[PDB]
Design an enzyme around this catalytic site. Structure first.
Site, PDB file in Angstrom:
ATOM      1  N   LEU A  14     112.693  32.278  -1.452  1.00 27.98           N
ATOM      2  CA  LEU A  14     111.904  31.833  -2.579  1.00 27.98           C
ATOM      3  C   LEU A  14     112.364  30.490  -3.099  1.00 27.98           C
ATOM      4  O   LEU A  14     111.559  29.677  -3.460  1.00 27.98           O
ATOM      5  CB  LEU A  14     111.882  32.863  -3.731  1.00 27.98           C
ATOM      6  CG  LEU A  14     111.221  34.234  -3.394  1.00 27.98           C
ATOM      7  CD1 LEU A  14     111.247  35.117  -4.599  1.00 27.98           C
ATOM      8  CD2 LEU A  14     109.775  34.079  -2.958  1.00 27.98           C
ATOM      9  N   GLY A  15     113.659  30.244  -3.149  1.00 25.69           N
ATOM     10  CA  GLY A  15     114.159  28.985  -3.690  1.00 25.69           C
ATOM     11  C   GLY A  15     115.662  28.999  -3.463  1.00 25.69           C
ATOM     12  O   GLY A  15     116.274  30.071  -3.139  1.00 25.69           O
ATOM     13  N   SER A  16     116.252  27.822  -3.560  1.00 26.54           N
ATOM     14  CA  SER A  16     117.682  27.735  -3.617  1.00 26.54           C
ATOM     15  C   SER A  16     118.054  26.578  -4.545  1.00 26.54           C
ATOM     16  O   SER A  16     117.292  25.631  -4.722  1.00 26.54           O
ATOM     17  CB  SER A  16     118.281  27.532  -2.225  1.00 26.54           C
ATOM     18  OG  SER A  16     118.136  26.197  -1.767  1.00 26.54           O
ATOM     19  N   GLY A  17     119.242  26.633  -5.113  1.00 31.22           N
ATOM     20  CA  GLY A  17     119.662  25.577  -6.052  1.00 31.22           C
ATOM     21  C   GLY A  17     120.942  26.055  -6.671  1.00 31.22           C
ATOM     22  O   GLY A  17     121.677  26.867  -6.032  1.00 31.22           O
TER      23      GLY A  17
ATOM     24  N   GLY B 124     121.873  29.711  -6.612  1.00 27.17           N
ATOM     25  CA  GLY B 124     122.064  30.390  -5.291  1.00 27.17           C
ATOM     26  C   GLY B 124     120.793  30.361  -4.427  1.00 27.17           C
ATOM     27  O   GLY B 124     119.990  29.392  -4.514  1.00 27.17           O
TER      28      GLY B 124
ATOM     29  N   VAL C 230     117.511  32.658  -3.284  1.00 30.71           N
ATOM     30  CA  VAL C 230     116.841  33.883  -3.720  1.00 30.71           C
ATOM     31  C   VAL C 230     115.801  34.158  -2.678  1.00 30.71           C
ATOM     32  O   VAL C 230     115.001  33.261  -2.376  1.00 30.71           O
ATOM     33  CB  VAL C 230     116.135  33.715  -5.101  1.00 30.71           C
ATOM     34  CG1 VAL C 230     115.336  34.956  -5.538  1.00 30.71           C
ATOM     35  CG2 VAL C 230     117.147  33.398  -6.196  1.00 30.71           C
TER      36      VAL C 230
ATOM     37  N   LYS D 192     119.100  37.801  -4.710  1.00 31.39           N
ATOM     38  CA  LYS D 192     119.834  36.592  -4.964  1.00 31.39           C
ATOM     39  C   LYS D 192     121.230  36.621  -4.363  1.00 31.39           C
ATOM     40  O   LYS D 192     121.986  37.570  -4.566  1.00 31.39           O
ATOM     41  CB  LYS D 192     119.947  36.364  -6.457  1.00 31.39           C
ATOM     42  CG  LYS D 192     120.709  35.090  -6.769  1.00 31.39           C
ATOM     43  CD  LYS D 192     121.079  35.023  -8.260  1.00 31.39           C
ATOM     44  CE  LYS D 192     120.014  34.281  -9.021  1.00 31.39           C
ATOM     45  NZ  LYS D 192     120.677  33.694 -10.230  1.00 31.39           N
TER      46      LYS D 192
ATOM     47  N   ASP E 262     106.629  30.508 -11.389  1.00 27.70           N
ATOM     48  CA  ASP E 262     107.506  30.106 -12.463  1.00 27.70           C
ATOM     49  C   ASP E 262     106.762  29.116 -13.406  1.00 27.70           C
ATOM     50  O   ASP E 262     105.758  28.449 -13.017  1.00 27.70           O
ATOM     51  CB  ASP E 262     108.850  29.606 -11.951  1.00 27.70           C
ATOM     52  CG  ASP E 262     108.776  28.217 -11.306  1.00 27.70           C
ATOM     53  OD1 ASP E 262     108.184  27.254 -11.864  1.00 27.70           O
ATOM     54  OD2 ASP E 262     109.381  28.082 -10.229  1.00 27.70           O
TER      55      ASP E 262
ATOM     56  N   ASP F  58     120.384  28.552 -20.639  1.00 27.68           N
ATOM     57  CA  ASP F  58     119.613  27.686 -19.758  1.00 27.68           C
ATOM     58  C   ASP F  58     118.105  27.933 -19.870  1.00 27.68           C
ATOM     59  O   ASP F  58     117.394  27.987 -18.863  1.00 27.68           O
ATOM     60  CB  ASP F  58     120.142  27.830 -18.314  1.00 27.68           C
ATOM     61  CG  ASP F  58     119.673  26.726 -17.400  1.00 27.68           C
ATOM     62  OD1 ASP F  58     119.282  25.621 -17.882  1.00 27.68           O
ATOM     63  OD2 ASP F  58     119.682  26.997 -16.168  1.00 27.68           O
TER      64      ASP F  58
END
Ligand SMILES: Oc1ccc(Cl)cc1-c1cc[nH]n1
Length: 267
Positions: free
Chosen positions: A10-13, A16, A18, A33, A90, A129
């Site tokens: 799904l994404g990383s950054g 971590g 996911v 995650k 998101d 955050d």
């Protein structure tokens, strides 16, 4: 391991990596995650990452927060099994696509963000955050969910002198002094979020603009909304609204139910 089926990344950054996943026992959608151990600056409790401590503290029943369903330890990482709404987007992508949000939609979203943050606070947890990227929209139910507690801390009433969330959402007192209190800092990030919702972008990019705290509206925004925003973005921390004051503000009256919201705005 074999208890979950892994789908696409799904994404990383800094949160971590996911992945989309499916709990095999009952096909529940999940998000898996992975955080690397040496990327974890912050641990609570055997020793777990603070993020797991915080999620256990808020993962009791009310659903404005992403629920931690389980976690595993591996030799170099922890794996967290999280709820996954489906379909989901998101808030940051949603804003990229749709531009500035109509007030009525921003009010519904923003209210749900406030309920989620009040619940974290009530559980003794400070997110640190809050921003569009950290908010998921369950597009069928119109329900928002806070994610990515990896910069959070136990809530306390004394001063914080560490921060690792998103700078353009961090308050002027953090920029100038490296000091903030949890509530008022949270409130400022809520001001940035709300401006972001109604203008389609964040108000400040540079330290100097943050420090100066002068808010220019680039979209047409109602006076009441501009006033809420300017209130959350007061330069002096103690001049910011409490959560109760924000939810009692005239711009916050008559919120749509999440389900109404999805029908009207999320089709
Ligand atoms: O934490 C999450 C839970 C569910 C889903 Cl769909 C995504 C995430 C996520 C995506 C990036 N950071 N966390």
């Amino acid at each position: 391991e074999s208890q979950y089926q892994v789908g696409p990344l799904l994404g990383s950054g800094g949160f971590g990596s996911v992945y989309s996943g499916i709990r095999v026992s009952d096909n529940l959608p999940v998000a898996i995650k992975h955080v690397e151990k040496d990327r974890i600056s912050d641990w609570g409790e055997t020793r777990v990452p603070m993020e797991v401590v915080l999620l256990k503290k808020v993962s009791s029943g009310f659903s404005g927060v992403i629920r931690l369903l389980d976690w595993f330890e591996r030799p170099d990482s922890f794996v967290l099994i999280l709820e996954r709404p489906e379909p989901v987007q998101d808030l940051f992508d949603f804003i990229t696509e749709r531009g500035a949000l109509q007030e009525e939609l921003a009010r519904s979203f923003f209210w749900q963000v406030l309920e989620a943050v009040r619940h974290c606070h009530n559980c003794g947890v400070l997110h640190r955050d809050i921003k569009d990227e950290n908010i998921l929209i369950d597009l069928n139910r119109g329900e928002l969910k806070l994610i990515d507690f990896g910069s959070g801390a136990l809530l306390k009433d004394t001063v914080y002198t560490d921060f690792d969330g998103t700078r353009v959402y961090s308050p002027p007192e953090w920029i100038r002094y490296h000091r903030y209190h949890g509530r008022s800092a949270a409130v400022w990030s809520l001001g940035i979020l709300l401006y972001d919702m109604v203008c389609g972008d964040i108000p400040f990019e540079h330290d100097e603009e943050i420090i100066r705290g002068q808010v220019f509206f680039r979209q047409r925004v109602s006076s009441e909304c501009q006033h809420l925003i300017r209130w959350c973005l007061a330069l002096r921390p103690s001049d910011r609204p409490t959560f109760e004051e924000i939810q009692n503000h005239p711009w916050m009256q008559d919120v749509l139910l999440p389900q109404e919201t999805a029908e009207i705005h999320l089709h």
